[model samples]
Target: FPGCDYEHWLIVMDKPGGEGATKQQMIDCYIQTLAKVVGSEEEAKKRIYNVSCERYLGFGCEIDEETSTKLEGLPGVLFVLPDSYVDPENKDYGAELFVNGEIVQRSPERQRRVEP
Candidate 1:
């Protein structure tokens, strides 16, 4: 919808299947998977800024909320999360808290809850 706002989201995904998958091939899959939803390989390239294949398989990209939700249904995709910071009150250490450049004070109750 026109009202939908685009935001940076971190997409965690399962490694591309197959025994000998090379890093380049894995990266291509990530790009294509995001492109499938954005509908443009060129646009996808511009939107994606980072891709992690070492400690984990994932990519960071700019997409609307609707697209983020849709990403979860795609094969290989594990989950979608808004880019966030982890520093919080000691009591809330484990929860990922959204932040942009600064603390941007927010209440824990306002954070988006995980969904099934």
Candidate 2:
């Protein structure tokens, strides 16, 4: 996450195809949910997100390695991802890695290598 800001990311919620939700309403409601946590609609507006749909995704800002388990504890967050990437093969949308290794937990969407 060198050039990428891990703390400021796009929250991609586990939107569908599972026990999770699929309503735009839920995504819209989180607008209030995140605003309360961070303190304002303006702030939430700039940071929060829903490119997936209904609480399906949002921004969890300045979320350092600490408590609240911020997004993890939320209702449907699938992955918190970096804001930039170029190598389409590596736009690991919703996972993380440290300053040491290549280990990863990439988003299924970015894992698009054709099978053998």
Candidate 3:
């Protein structure tokens, strides 16, 4: 998955625990970080982002090797994936909306829902 051409990824956030940042803090950190990394405004004339873990379902958006590496390196980011998926191998990773995970697979409506 590292060297391959990939589109979207499921980027989970580090959940808040004792003495840790709140979900809101993590969301703000992520939003600012991404906006900095890709550059967008708060009101956002945007596209570089697709979703956030409002439901704690980590379906997020587009990235290449560099961007993915940057995200994976982010402190509060739990994990991001090109994942253990290699079959269907032809699935479009970049549609207006897309995600590959058991939760979403079992519940088709469980993808990419976000807040402002």
lDDT, candidate 1, 44-85, per-residue tens: 777775666666677767787888998999989998887642
Off by over 4 Å in 2: 1-3, 16-27, 53-68, 86-116
lDDT of 3 by residue, 45-103 (tens): 14233334455534355555567677777666777776322222333232223222111
Residue-level lDDT tens digits of model 2 in 1-116:
43365554555555433455454454454454455556775655554422333323443333433322465566666665555432335433332321111223435554443111
Better of 2 and 3 by TM-score: 3
Point to the candidate with the largest lDDT: 1
> lDDT score, residue 81, model 2?
56
Clashes of 1: 0
lDDT of 1 at 46: 73
Model 3 residue runs over 4 Å out of place are: 1-5, 16-27, 41-45, 52-59, 83-116
What C-alpha lDDT do the candidate models reach, one value each? 0.63, 0.43, 0.46
Cα deviation of 4, candidate 1, in Å: 16
**Model 1 Cα shift for residue 81 (angstroms):** 0.9
* 1 or 3, greater by TM-score: 1
User: How many backbone clashes does every candidate have?
Assistant: 0, 5, 0
